[PDB]
Design a protein around this nucleic acid. Structure first.
Lengths: 139, 101, 189, 314, 225, 66, 139
RNA sequence: UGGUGGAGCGAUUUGUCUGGUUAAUUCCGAUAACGAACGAGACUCUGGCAUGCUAACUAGUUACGCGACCGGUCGGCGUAAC
C-alpha cells in the first residue's frame, strides 16, 4: 500500500487529522485573521485549515521533490476576479507557504535540498505511507 | 583532442544539410569517432504588422516568419585535424562555432 | 452485457411508432456505458440519427451562454435526472425518455410562403428526424426555463418535465408547444 | 484423369498477393507477400470451414513487398520491397535479422542461392546487386546490366556451373555467372516487356514470359531456343512442377497448366460462376507457387485471395 | 559577452539592408546591380556587382578604398578585415535594378518617355528574357497624374514561382515638374544548371523524353559473349 | 468536385501515344513509369497524370479514343 | 517479452508499456479507479469490460500520459491500453486471437484503435476565433 | 487581351460558344476560326499517417545496480540496448 494506491481526497483529511492529533505543529498568531491568497474574498471557513494546508503541502512534496515557496505559491493559485475587468490567474500567499514549510521542518518531516529546494525525509515518507495504509484499510 | 563540438546554424535547410553532411563524410573517411547531427527545435521569429501606412483600410495584417535551423556535430579528434576539417568547409549562408571541453 | 451508467438495461426498452423506429438509436448495437462519446456525428447528413438518444439529450442540455462547453456537468445532470425518474415512476428511465420524445414531436408544422410583416403560412408534414430534433429541443427548453429562477434543481426539473411529457400531461412545456404548433397548422391547413 | 479443383481460399491479406513462397521441409507452412506492406505466414489446418488460418504477419516493410523467398531450413526468410531495401527475417519469433540497404529505387525481385550463402537482387536501378549472408553489398554490376528495369532474377539449382537469369523491360533475358559476372547468353526472342523468368527443378530449362503473352523455353547447357508456348493475355508468373513435369503460367484472369512432351492444353483455371461483378474486369492472378510434395498449386490473385488447386487423380 | 542567435541573425539582416541602401545611393550612377557579403573570422569580403566597374574603382583604384575606409570607420570592425571587391555583372539585361537605373538616368537625359521605355524593352527582350513589364507613373503630360504600362513576352503574377522566376525594381525619377515612379519586372529563362535564371522549371511545365525507334525482332537469335 | 485541367490532360495524352506499350491498367505501375518517362515538377501533378493515364488505358480496350 | 505503444488525442499522448505478469493496470503509477475525472471512469474501463479481465490475466501494462487536457488524456490512455493489448496479442500470440480482439474493439467504437485526426484550427486576423468575425456597424 | 484569318463604310464584333459538366472562361464537345498569353489550377507554408530509414548527456524510454518507504511507488542517483 502506497499514497498513489489510495484516494487523494480522503488522504489529506486523514493526514490533517494525524497532524492535529500530534499537537506539536507551530500554528502562527494570525491564522484566525489572514486570507490564503491575493484573490480570495473571505477567510477560510474551517478553523483547522492550517493542518489541511500542511497535510496538502506534505502530500505535494511526497509526489515530486525540490519544491520551494514560489512553487507552493504556484500550487495554491487561482482565478482573480477584477469586478468589471476580466479575470486573470493570481498566485497564493508566500507567508502561509513559508510558515507551513517552516512548521513541517519543525516535525523533521521535510528538509532542504543540496540542489536548492525541499524534499520529504525518510521519517516523512514513513508517516505519509503509513497514513495511506490505514486510509486503504478503511475500505 | 578532447570533445570538440561544432555548432552549425543557418536560415536555409538545403545548404546547412549539404555542408554538415560534407563535414560528417570528411570526418568518417579519416576513421574518427563522430556523434551525428543533433537537430534542435527550429526557432521561428514572427512579426505581424498592419499592411497600410495610413490606417483607413479593412485592417489587413502581414505575417513575416524568419526560420533558424541549428545542428550540432561532435568529434573525439585532435585539434590540429579539427582546425583543417573546420577550415576547408566554408559556405555563404551558414554560421559555424567550434568549442573544446 | 452493456448498461447505461452500468445500471440501466437497453433490452426491456420498447419503441411504439414504426416512423421513429430507425431514428431513436438506443438499442442493442448502440448500447454505451456513458452518454459522452466525442464522436463525429455532426460531420455530414443523417449521421446524428446513429447518435445515442441519451447523448443527443445531454448535448442539447448545454445550450445557454454560460454552459456552452460544459458537457461533464450535463452528463451528471442526466445521471441524477435518470435516478430521479426511476425513483418517481419505478420503471426504466430510457422508456420514459423514448415515451417523452414519441409524444413531444409535432406531426404537422407550418411553413412561410408570402412576404415579411404579413402572416400567411401553409401547413406541411414533419420528417421523423425533425420530430426527434424539436422533441429534444422543447424538452430541454421546458426543463431549463422551468428551473431558472426557483429552488428546484435542473436534474429534478428535467425529471418532472420527462414524467409529464411521457404520460402526455398538459403541465409539460413540450406538450403545450406541440399542441399549439399543430393547432396553428390546423388553423392554416 | 488429373484435373485441378478449388479446395479452399485462404483469406488474409488485404492487398494484391504479389508473391507466394513454400519449402519442402515444412509442408503445413507457406509464406505469402502482399501490397498491404505485410508478409503473412499461414498454418495450413486443411479444415472443412477454411483451408488455412492467418498464423503470423511480418511487418515493417513500409511500401509494397514485391518478392518473398525462404531458405532450405524453415528458420530464415528474405524479401524485397518498393521502399528499396531487403529484409532477412527470423521466421520462428517473426523479427528482422538483417537489413540490406543498397538500392536506390524500388526492388522488384530477389533470389536465394542453393547452398544459402549468396543473394542476387534486381530493382528499377538498371543494375543487379550481389549480397552475401552477413548483409554487406559484394558486387553492383553496371557492365550493360539492363537498358530498362529488371523484372525477375533467379538462381539455377544444380551441381554444374552456377548461373543467374535476369529478364527486364528492355526485352532482354540475360544470364550472369556468380564470382565471374560476365555474359554467356543474351536472348532476343520476345516482343514486349517481361515480368517473370523461372528455372526448372532439375536446372536445365529457362522459361521467360511477360506482356507478349507467349512463354519461350531455352536450355542453359547450350544457350538456344526450344519452344514458343502461345498463352492468352499478359504472363504474371511461370513455375515448373517439381514431380509432374508441367509448366504453369499466368494469364490475367486465368491460369494455364501445360505438358512439355505433348505441348497441349492440360487444364484452364477460371473461378467465375456468379455474374454480380461480370461487368468489371476479372481479378488478375499474380503469383504461382507449388506445395512440398508437388501435388498442389498455390495461386495469388489481385482480389486479396490465395486459392489452392488440388490435382484430383482417378 | 555574445548576443543571442536570434538577435545575431537579425543584426546581419540590418547590416545587409543598410549596406545595400548606402551602396545604391553611392553607385546608382554606375549601375550598381547588387552586393554579396561572405564573412570569415580572419576577414569578411564584400563583392559589388555593377554595370561599369572601371568607373566604380576610380582613378587607379582610388574610390574603392574611399568606400573601404567608410564601412571600416562606420560599422567599427577592425582595419585589414575588409577588401571591397568589384566583380563584373554576367548579363546586365536580366537585372531589373540595372535596367530601372538606366531608364532613370536616360529619362534625366531629357528623352521622351515612350522611346526611353521602349529602348529598355527592346534591350531586355534582346538580352534573352522570357518577358518584360515596364511601368512609368506620375505627371507624364499635363497637370494630371497618369500611368503608362508596357508589356512583352510572358509575365506571371501569382503563386510561389513569382518569388524566384520574375525579379522587380521600383525607382523614383526627380523631374522639374514632380516625381515619376519606374517599376521594371523581368521574367527570366529556364537556365538549367546555371547562374542566369532558376534551376527548377515552372511547376505547370511537363517535359517528356522522345522514344528511341526500337526495331522489333521477328526470328529468335541469341548473341554469345 | 474535381476536374482534370488541360495540363494533366495534354501530358497524359502525349504519354499514351508515345509509351502505350509501356503502360497498363494498374495505377501504381503507371505512377512509377511516369517518373522515369517525364521530368515532372511535383508529386501531386505526377499522381494526377498517372491517375488519368490509368483512366484512359481502361477505355482504350473498350473502343478507339479520339 | 514486452511491447510499448502510444495513444493520441488532440495534443494528449499516453504511452502504454505492456509486459507479462499478474494483470497489473497502472497509469502514471496510479490505478484507473483513482483517475481524477471520475465522472468518465467507465471510459477507462471500456477496453477491459469489452474484452474481459481473462485476456488481461497474463499482461502488466504501465501507461504514462503527457500533454493535452483532462478528457483528451482519458481518450489517449483508453486508446493506448487497447492498442498495447492488440500489439502484444499480435507479436507473442496467433494472428487469429489478435483478429478475435480487433473485430470486437472496432465493432464497439473505431476510436479505440484509429486516432481522431482533427486538431485546434488556426485563428485569422479580423475576428476573435478561426471563423467568427467582429461586429460590422453600418452608420 | 494581342497576332494572323473571317464579318461590317464605321464605332465594333467573332475567337471568348447552342447543350452538358466544374469551386472555376474547369473540362468535354460543337465550331469562321486557328494558334497563343494572364488570371483559375499548378505552386509554396501549415495540420493529419510511418513500431520503415539517418541520428541524439542541451530529449526521453526500457533494463540493470544502489538507495528511501511499505512483489509495488519514486521527476530518488549512476551505467548498458535502442
Amino acid at each position: 500500500v502506497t499514497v498513489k494506491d489510495v484516494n487523494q481526497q480522503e488522504f489529506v483529511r486523514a493526514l490533517a487529522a494525524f497532524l492535529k492529533k500530534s499537537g506539536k505543529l507551530k500554528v502562527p498568531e494570525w491564522v484566525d485573521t489572514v486570507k490564503l491568497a491575493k484573490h480570495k474574498e473571505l477567510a477560510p471557513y474551517d478553523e483547522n485549515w492550517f493542518y489541511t494546508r500542511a497535510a496538502s503541502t506534505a502530500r505535494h512534496l511526497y509526489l515530486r521533490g525540490g519544491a520551494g515557496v514560489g512553487s507552493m505559491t504556484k500550487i495554491y493559485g487561482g482565478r482573480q476576479r477584477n469586478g468589471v475587468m476580466p479575470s486573470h490567474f493570481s498566485r497564493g500567499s508566500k507567508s502561509v507557504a513559508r510558515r507551513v514549510l517552516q512548521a513541517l521542518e519543525g516535525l523533521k518531516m521535510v528538509e532542504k535540498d543540496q540542489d536548492g529546494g525541499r524534499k520529504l525525509t525518510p521519517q516523512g515518507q514513513r508517516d505519509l505511507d503509513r497514513i495511506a495504509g490505514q486510509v486503504a484499510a478503511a475500505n | 583532442i578532447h570533445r570538440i563540438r561544432i555548432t552549425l546554424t543557418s536560415r536555409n535547410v538545403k545548404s546547412l544539410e549539404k555542408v554538415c553532411a560534407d563535414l560528417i563524410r570528411g570526418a568518417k573517411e579519416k576513421n574518427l569517432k563522430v556523434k551525428g547531427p543533433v537537430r534542435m527545435p527550429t526557432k521561428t521569429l514572427r512579426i505581424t504588422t498592419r499592411k497600410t501606412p495610413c490606417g483607413e483600410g479593412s485592417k489587413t495584417w502581414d505575417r513575416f516568419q524568419m526560420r533558424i535551423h541549428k545542428r550540432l556535430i561532435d568529434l573525439h579528434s585532435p585539434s590540429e585535424i579539427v582546425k583543417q576539417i573546420t577550415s576547408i568547409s566554408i559556405e555563404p549562408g551558414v554560421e559555424v562555432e567550434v568549442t573544446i571541453a | 452485457d452493456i448498461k447505461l451508467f452500468g445500471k440501466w438495461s437497453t433490452d426491456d426498452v420498447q419503441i411504439n411508432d414504426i416512423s421513429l423506429q430507425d431514428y431513436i438509436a438506443v438499442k442493442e448495437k448502440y448500447a454505451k456505458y456513458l452518454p459522452h462519446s466525442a464522436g463525429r456525428y455532426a460531420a455530414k447528413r443523417f449521421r446524428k440519427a446513429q447518435c445515442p438518444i441519451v447523448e443527443r439529450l445531454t448535448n442539447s442540455m448545454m445550450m445557454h451562454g454560460r454552459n456552452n462547453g460544459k458537457k461533464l456537468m450535463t452528463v451528471r445532470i442526466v445521471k441524477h435526472a435518470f435516478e430521479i425518474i426511476h425513483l418517481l415512476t419505478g420503471e426504466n428511465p430510457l422508456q420514459v425518455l423514448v415515451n417523452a420524445i414519441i409524444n413531444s414531436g409535432p406531426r404537422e408544422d407550418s411553413t412561410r410562403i408570402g412576404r415579411a410583416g404579413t402572416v400567411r403560412r401553409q401547413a406541411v408534414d414533419v420528417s421523423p428526424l425533425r420530430r426527434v430534433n424539436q422533441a429534444i429541443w422543447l424538452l430541454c427548453t421546458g426543463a431549463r426555463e422551468a428551473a431558472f429562477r426557483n429552488i428546484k434543481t435542473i436534474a429534478e426539473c428535467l425529471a418532472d418535465e420527462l414524467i409529464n411529457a411521457a404520460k402526455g400531461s398538459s403541465n409539460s412545456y413540450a406538450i403545450k408547444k406541440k399542441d399549439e404548433l399543430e393547432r396553428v397548422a390546423k388553423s392554416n391547413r | 484423369t488429373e484435373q485441378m479443383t478449388l479446395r479452399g481460399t485462404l483469406k488474409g491479406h488485404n492487398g494484391w498477393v504479389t508473391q507466394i513462397a513454400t519449402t519442402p521441409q515444412f509442408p503445413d507452412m507457406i509464406l505469402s507477400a502482399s501490397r498491404d506492406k505485410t508478409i503473412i505466414m499461414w498454418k495450413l489446418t486443411r479444415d472443412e470451414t477454411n483451408y488455412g488460418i492467418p498464423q503470423r504477419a511480418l511487418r515493417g516493410h513500409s511500401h509494397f513487398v514485391s518478392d518473398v523467398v525462404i531458405s532450405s531450413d524453415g528458420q530464415f526468410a528474405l524479401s524485397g520491397s518498393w521502399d528499396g531495401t531487403l529484409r532477412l527475417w527470423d521466421l520462428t519469433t517473426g523479427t528482422t535479422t538483417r537489413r540490406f540497404v543498397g538500392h536506390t529505387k524500388d526492388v522488384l525481385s530477389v533470389a536465394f542461392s542453393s547452398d544459402n550463402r549468396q543473394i542476387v537482387s534486381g530493382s528499377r536501378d538498371k543494375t543487379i546487386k550481389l549480397w552475401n549472408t552477413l548483409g554487406v553489398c559484394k558486387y553492383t554490376v553496371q557492365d550493360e546490366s539492363h537498358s530498362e528495369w529488371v523484372s525477375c532474377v533467379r538462381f539455377s539449382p544444380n551441381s554444374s556451373n552456377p548461373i543467374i537469369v535476369s529478364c527486364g523491360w528492355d526485352k532482354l533475358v540475360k544470364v550472369w555467372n556468380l564470382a565471374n559476372c560476365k555474359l554467356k547468353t543474351n536472348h532476343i526472342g520476345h516482343t514486349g516487356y517481361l515480368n517473370t523468368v523461372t528455372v526448372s527443378p532439375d536446372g536445365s530449362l529457362c522459361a521467360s514470359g511477360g506482356k507478349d503473352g507467349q512463354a519461350m523455353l531455352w536450355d542453359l547447357n547450350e544457350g538456344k531456343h526450344l519452344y514458343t508456348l502461345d498463352g492468352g493475355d499478359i504472363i504474371n508468373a511461370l513455375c515448373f512442377s517439381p514431380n509432374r513435369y508441367w509448366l504453369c503460367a499466368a494469364t490475367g484472369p486465368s491460369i494455364k497448366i501445360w505438358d512439355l512432351e505433348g505441348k497441349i492444353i492440360v487444364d484452364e483455371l477460371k473461378q467465375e460462376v456468379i455474374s454480380t461483378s461480370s461487368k468489371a474486369e476479372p481479378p488478375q492472378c499474380t503469383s504461382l507457387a507449388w506445395s512440398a510434395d508437388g501435388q498442389t498449386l498455390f495461386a495469388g490473385y489481385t482480389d486479396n485471395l490465395v486459392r489452392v488447386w488440388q490435382v484430383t487423380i482417378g | 559577452v555574445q548576443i543571442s542567435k536570434k538577435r545575431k541573425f537579425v543584426a546581419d539582416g540590418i547590416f545587409k539592408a543598410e549596406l545595400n541602401e548606402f551602396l545604391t545611393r553611392e553607385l546608382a550612377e554606375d549601375g550598381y546591380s547588387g552586393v554579396e557579403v561572405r564573412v570569415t573570422p580572419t576577414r569578411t569580403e564584400i563583392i559589388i556587382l555593377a554595370t561599369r566597374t572601371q568607373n566604380v574603382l576610380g582613378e587607379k583604384g582610388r574610390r574603392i578604398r574611399e568606400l573601404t575606409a567608410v564601412v571600416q570607420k562606420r560599422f567599427g570592425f577592425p582595419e585589414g578585415s575588409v577588401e571591397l571587391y568589384a566583380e563584373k555583372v554576367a548579363t546586365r539585361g536580366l537585372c531589373a535594378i540595372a535596367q530601372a537605373e538606366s531608364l532613370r538616368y536616360k529619362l534625366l537625359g531629357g528623352l521622351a518617355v515612350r522611346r526611353a521605355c521602349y529602348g529598355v524593352l527592346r534591350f531586355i527582350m534582346e538580352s534573352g528574357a522570357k518577358g518584360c513589364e515596364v511601368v512609368v507613373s506620375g505627371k507624364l503630360r499635363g497637370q494630371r497624374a497618369k500611368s503608362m504600362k508596357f508589356v512583352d513576352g510572358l509575365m506571371i503574377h501569382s503563386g510561389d514561382p513569382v518569388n524566384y522566376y520574375v525579379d522587380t525594381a521600383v525607382r523614383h525619377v526627380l523631374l522639374r515638374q514632380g516625381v515619376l515612379g519606374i517599376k521594371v519586372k523581368i521574367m527570366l529563362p529556364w537556365d538549367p544548371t546555371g547562374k542566369i535564371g532558376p534551376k527548377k522549371p515552372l511547376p505547370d511545365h511537363v517535359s517528356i523524353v522522345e522514344p528511341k525507334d526500337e526495331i522489333l525482332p521477328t526470328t529468335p537469335i541469341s548473341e554469345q559473349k | 468536385g474535381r476536374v482534370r485541367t488541360k495540363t494533366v490532360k495534354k501530358a497524359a495524352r502525349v504519354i499514351i501515344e508515345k509509351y502505350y506499350t509501356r503502360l497498363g491498367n494498374d495505377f501504381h505501375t503507371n505512377k512509377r513509369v511516369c517518373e522515369e518517362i517525364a521530368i515532372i515538377p511535383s508529386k501531386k501533378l505526377r499522381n494526377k497524370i498517372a491517375g488519368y493515364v490509368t483512366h484512359l488505358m481502361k477505355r482504350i480496350q473498350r473502343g478507339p479514343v479520339r | 517479452q514486452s511491447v510499448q505503444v502510444f495513444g493520441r488525442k488532440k495534443t494528449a499522448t499516453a504511452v502504454a508499456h505492456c509486459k507479462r505478469g499478474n494483470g497489473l493496470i497502472k497509469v502514471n503509477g496510479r490505478p484507473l479507479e483513482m483517475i481524477e475525472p471520475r465522472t468518465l471512469q467507465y471510459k477507462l474501463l471500456e477496453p477491459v469490460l469489452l474484452l474481459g479481465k481473462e485476456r488481461f490475466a497474463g499482461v502488466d501494462i504501465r501507461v504514462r500520459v503527457k500533454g493535452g487536457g483532462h478528457v483528451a488524456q482519458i481518450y489517449a490512455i483508453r486508446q493506448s491500453i487497447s492498442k498495447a493489448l492488440v500489439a502484444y496479442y499480435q507479436k507473442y500470440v496467433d494472428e487469429a486471437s489478435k483478429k478475435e480482439i480487433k473485430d470486437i474493439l472496432i465493432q464497439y467504437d473505431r476510436t479505440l484503435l484509429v486516432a481522431d485526426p482533427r486538431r485546434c484550427e488556426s485563428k485569422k486576423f479580423g475576428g476573435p476565433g478561426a471563423r467568427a468575425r467582429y461586429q460590422k456597424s453600418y452608420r
